[PDB]
Write an enzyme that holds these catalytic residues in place. Sequence first.
Site, PDB file in Angstrom:
ATOM      1  N   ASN A   1       0.780  -1.225   0.000  1.00 43.26           N
ATOM      2  CA  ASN A   1       0.000   0.000   0.000  1.00 43.26           C
ATOM      3  C   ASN A   1       0.822   1.290   0.000  1.00 43.26           C
ATOM      4  OD1 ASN A   1      -2.012  -2.020   0.363  1.00 43.26           O
ATOM      5  ND2 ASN A   1      -3.310  -0.556   1.492  1.00 43.26           N
TER       6      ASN A   1
ATOM      7  N   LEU B   1       2.460   7.391  -4.221  1.00 46.30           N
ATOM      8  CA  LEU B   1       2.647   8.813  -4.229  1.00 46.30           C
ATOM      9  C   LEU B   1       1.479   9.311  -5.064  1.00 46.30           C
ATOM     10  CD1 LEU B   1       5.859  10.485  -5.729  1.00 46.30           C
ATOM     11  CD2 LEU B   1       3.626  10.595  -6.862  1.00 46.30           C
TER      12      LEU B   1
ATOM     13  N   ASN C   1       3.799   4.584  12.189  1.00 47.82           N
ATOM     14  CA  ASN C   1       4.270   3.456  13.011  1.00 47.82           C
ATOM     15  C   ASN C   1       5.564   3.917  13.666  1.00 47.82           C
ATOM     16  OD1 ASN C   1       2.336   1.411  12.180  1.00 47.82           O
ATOM     17  ND2 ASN C   1       3.517   1.140  10.302  1.00 47.82           N
TER      18      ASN C   1
ATOM     19  N   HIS D   1      -4.632   7.553  11.793  1.00 50.72           N
ATOM     20  CA  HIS D   1      -3.749   7.580  10.641  1.00 50.72           C
ATOM     21  C   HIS D   1      -4.495   7.229   9.356  1.00 50.72           C
ATOM     22  CE1 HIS D   1      -2.645   3.479   9.016  1.00 50.72           C
ATOM     23  NE2 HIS D   1      -3.573   3.194   9.915  1.00 50.72           N
TER      24      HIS D   1
END
Length: 441
Positions: A197, A200, A323, A393
């Site tokens: 995943n 850009l 993370n 996130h």
Amino acid sequence: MFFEKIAPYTYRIPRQGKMRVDAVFFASKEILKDLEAENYASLQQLMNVATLPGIVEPALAMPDIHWGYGFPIGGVAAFDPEEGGVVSPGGVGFDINCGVRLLASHLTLEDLLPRQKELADALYRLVPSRDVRFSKRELKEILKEGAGWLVKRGYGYPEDVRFIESQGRLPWANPDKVSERAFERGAPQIGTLGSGNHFLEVQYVDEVYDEEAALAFGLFKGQVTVLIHTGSRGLGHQVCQDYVERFLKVAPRYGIELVDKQLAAAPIKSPEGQDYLQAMAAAANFAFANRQLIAHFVREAFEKVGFTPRDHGLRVLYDLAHNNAKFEEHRGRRVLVHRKGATRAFGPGHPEVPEEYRRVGQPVLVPGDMGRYSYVLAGTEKAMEVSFGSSCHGAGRNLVKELAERGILVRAAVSLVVEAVEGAGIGKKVARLRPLIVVKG
């Protein structure tokens, strides 16, 4: 019947059994329905996290929480070193500092569309899946210094570093603690997106929710942006693997009881704990540098198709990890905060927030899936109190064929989450971003 509601979109799992502290999670009436159908598996994982030594109340989980390795994805867990706290690779996730960088330009949709094809082609060509290489000593310095090393050598603008979380440098990095395998595995990957995943995308701001924060962040409707999603590549993954197994084969000595072996942890103050933290920091610095390099190439792609530096004015709005474990000040003490699939989200007045944004809070970049909406939120004061200054996130929960139907060029080799976050008071909505071009690794 094992959790009560304490505030809008906020639920508490009172301490029970092996839990050392309460757990608290943020969710919607609708999200709860989703977890309920899941037998509350991710919550059981959140409860397991709460059984770890030195954990600071409460163990937390964001609205997009789900099954993960040991710790749930979307989890936040602070540990106090002075209380015998531990550090767990599973609490950070395998892709250390997998994160997001958002560039904001002076261009508007109208200015970009006519060169959409040229740019897509230039991005696919200038962003590896070309001939820029560093020596082992150089990438060694990169692991210690972070994104700033690259900026100081011309791979960015001088000001880029100011808008990266921790200025793109975790202070404890030590390449010596990074295995040869991790080093060689990620070294030739610097400047690449990777697979899975990671991507850009060139997008445009299609909605502005907070005029004051948007102004402060330099965002406006119709404005062209570029979102870079990637991490430490193979290096961070290997470092996680190296230490999980090292932590498993030394867990006896410390007497740390693990209800789930995937919760493998070691005392923050132990040699093994200290080593992982140093290697994790090195991996994070590598990820910071990787995004910095990609941003440099993105600027090169805009220029290659005709947009001069003064035309595109591609500046770093912000760059942050999704993370990571970091030492931070909370409750007047230094604690180690594990965040897997969750973001640091400091609020107004915080010294660690760039002055330009200090009045409105730290930007929080919430990428959606590829070809889906992305959001920009701002950190809040309430989050400083209730979530160790943390936010979400993620925005969600034939692949490229349907992407060309929604007007999105691809180059390959209403969010409930955001709703819950804003509702819980730990993430103010600032803007929404719609993709135009998607470049996959």
